[PDB]
Amino acid sequence: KTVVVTTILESPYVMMKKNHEMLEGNERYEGYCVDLAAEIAKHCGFKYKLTIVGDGKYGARDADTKIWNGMVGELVYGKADIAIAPLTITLVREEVIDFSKPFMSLGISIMIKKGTPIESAEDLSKQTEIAYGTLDSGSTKEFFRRSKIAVFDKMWTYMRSAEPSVFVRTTAEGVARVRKSKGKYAYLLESTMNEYIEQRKPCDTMKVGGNLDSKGYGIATPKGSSLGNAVNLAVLKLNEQGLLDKLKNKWWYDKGEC
Amino acid sequence: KTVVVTTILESPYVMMKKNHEMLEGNERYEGYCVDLAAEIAKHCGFKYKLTIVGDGKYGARDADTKIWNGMVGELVYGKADIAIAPLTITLVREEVIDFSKPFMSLGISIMIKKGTPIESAEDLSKQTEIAYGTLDSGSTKEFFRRSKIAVFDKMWTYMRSAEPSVFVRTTAEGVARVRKSKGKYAYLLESTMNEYIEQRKPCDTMKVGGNLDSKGYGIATPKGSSLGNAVNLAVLKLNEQGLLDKLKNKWWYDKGEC
Ligand SMILES: N[C@@H](Cn1cc(Cl)c(=O)[nH]c1=O)C(=O)O
Ligand SMILES: N[C@@H](Cn1cc(Cl)c(=O)[nH]c1=O)C(=O)O
Ligand SMILES: [Zn+2]
Ligand SMILES: [Zn+2]
Ligand SMILES: [Zn+2]
Ligand SMILES: [Zn+2]
């Protein structure tokens, strides 16, 4: 009966509330996806439990074991009924789980420390002084691994071989590396995250250039789940009624510190 | 056997070729959706025939008879197997037909004659010297009919009762109205169309302000069509390989005349 929702701690989508140790169950968390889950649940008429994905991963299939990890894995192996998270709709995932129409649009983007002489991916690919990398697992790293586009292939060829690693375990790690590297590390990350961090103190980062690609986040369910239809219709209704635009403003810009 | 594709003449998605009269079948047409249809068919392995929707409409349900018209109607009543067009994914349509994930993002936007003293929807709403309207049927009109947002509800109240009608039968008529009205008509239209027209001679229009909403176009099939799965996967593959971005550049900006 109670729907198990898998999600991931990624600001400002899902965050621990300041007083979380005093709170129980779903009340421990806040953020864009916490708000969205409550609306999806109200509109589809189900009770739910938010659970943070155990391995802290979005979802990839291991080439060796062929096992899926992360939120995708939780759906594929029946540990969760729905994923409500900044989970990128991709072909390889759509083969194993179902996605709603997108609730947010985004693209891969460049984050620099202010004053870094970089305006584009082409700029990054033509030089070697400034290192650059991505989140170590996820759709951004896979975009680069798989790209046949010359500039992105060049960038991947550099990143896959760079030592020490240019890849990071978490967005927070990537942002800290930008901030601490004196302009010598740029971070490739999803544009929505880039925009959020740009509005956070110490206000020393910025998004530069256009997005490298265009894609979306969707709500995911196990392939063939009965919940999928209602969830998809709910996403469409909430977009049409302006809920999604309101939530982005609430969590990105209303609180902006810059 | 051969898949019947319904589409609509709307630039630069589907246009007749300059020499279209010396050509037959699918060869009469060119454009973003013509190229897209070719790629979808190649990846899904079907042969197809492009047909222009008989009533020239996108699709809406008659409130009295409950009959669907336009491309949506062609799918609903089994006259076509798939619609490959700038067809907006909406809740009411998703209830009666299936949509792929979106192949293009867009939002409602404002087109003005250059020099018109308007920067936003709010500006249009606060004045009466400059008239404004939308395509007389389709998702844009419906956005205003249904909007609870104050500025948009205000705009709708004006538009529904304006005389003579501020509504137009085709985009071409809307653009012509802007161009001939000496700044006294502004046109509300999908951002993709607005961006295309801004780059065509006589180069006398521009898009102003941000988009009023965010949505997507999707490839549509009849509810429960087997074709639906393959087509959806095909759209995701085409996006991931950069083909959709290549097509947008080809049809909007490579050709730019301004
Ligand atoms: N959304 C991605 C995960 N993800 C997240 C961020 Cl913030 C990023 O910059 N890159 C990613 O791959 C996915 O679903 O794999
Ligand atoms: N895409 C829409 C139709 N459509 C098209 C244009 Cl160009 C517009 O400005 N407004 C619309 O409603 C639909 O699917 O109804
Ligand atoms: Zn804590
Ligand atoms: Zn609600
Ligand atoms: Zn002719
Ligand atoms: Zn292809």
CA gap B231, A236 in Å, rounded: 20
The alpha carbon of A205 is separated from its chain's Cα centroid by a whole number of angstroms, namely 18
The alpha carbon of B85 is separated from its chain's Cα centroid by a whole number of angstroms, namely 7
CA gap B209, B30 in Å, rounded: 31
CATH node for A1-106+216-255? 3.40.190.10
Q: B12: cis peptide before it, omega within 30°?
A: yes
> Alpha helices, DSSP H only, in B162-226?
171-180, 191-198
| Residue partners of B164: CB distance under 8 A and separation at least 6 | none
Rounded to the nearest angstrom, the minimum Cα separation between B100 and chain A is 8
CA gap A210, B241 in Å, rounded: 18
CA gap B22, B28 in Å, rounded: 8
Contact at 8 Å (CB) between A6 and A56?
Answer: no
> Sign of the CA dihedral A56, A62, A64, A67?
positive
The domain segmentation of chain A, as residue ranges, is 1-106+216-255, 107-215
Nearest alpha-carbon partner for A111 in A175, A162, A155, A160:
A175
Q: Structure resolution in Å?
A: 1.7
The reply to whether B139 sits in an annotated binding site is: yes
Contact at 8 Å (CB) between A80 and A6?
Answer: yes
Q: Which residues of A touch B90 (CB under 8 A)?
A: 236, 240
Q: Answer whether B139 contacts ligand 2 (Cβ < 6 A).
A: yes
Q: Which of B102, B242, B244 sits opposite A149 (nearest CB)?
A: B242
Amino acid at B75: L
Tokens 């009919």 -> residue: B145
Q: Write out chain A in H/E/C secondary structure.
A: CCEEEEECCECCCEEECCCHHHCCHHHHEECHHHHHHHHHHHHHCCCEEEEECCCCCCCCECCCCCCECHHHHHHHCCCCCEECCCCECCHHHHCCEEECCCCEEECEEEEEECCCCCCCHHHHHCCCCCEEECECCCHHHHHHHHCCCHHHHHHHHHHHHCCCCCCECCHHHHHHHHHHCCCCEEEEEEHHHHHHHHCCCCCCEEEECCCCCCEEECCEEECCCCHHHHHHHHHHHHHHCCHHHHHHHHHHHCCCCC
Contact at 8 Å (CB) between B236 and A89?
Answer: yes
Q: A164: cis peptide before it, omega within 30°?
A: yes
Q: What is the DSSP letter of B167?
A: -
Beta strand A108-113 with A185-190 is antiparallel
Q: Which helix (H) or strand (E) holds B152?
A: helix B150-161
Fold agreement between A1-106+216-255 and A107-215: yes
Contact at 8 Å (CB) between B86 and B15?
Answer: no
| Ligand 1 neighbours by CB, cut-off 6 Å | A 58, 86-88, 135, 138-140, 171, 189-190, 193
Superfamily of domain A107-215: Periplasmic binding protein-like II (3.40.190.10)
Please list all protein residues whose beta carbon sits less than 5 angstroms from ligand 3, which is an ion: A 16
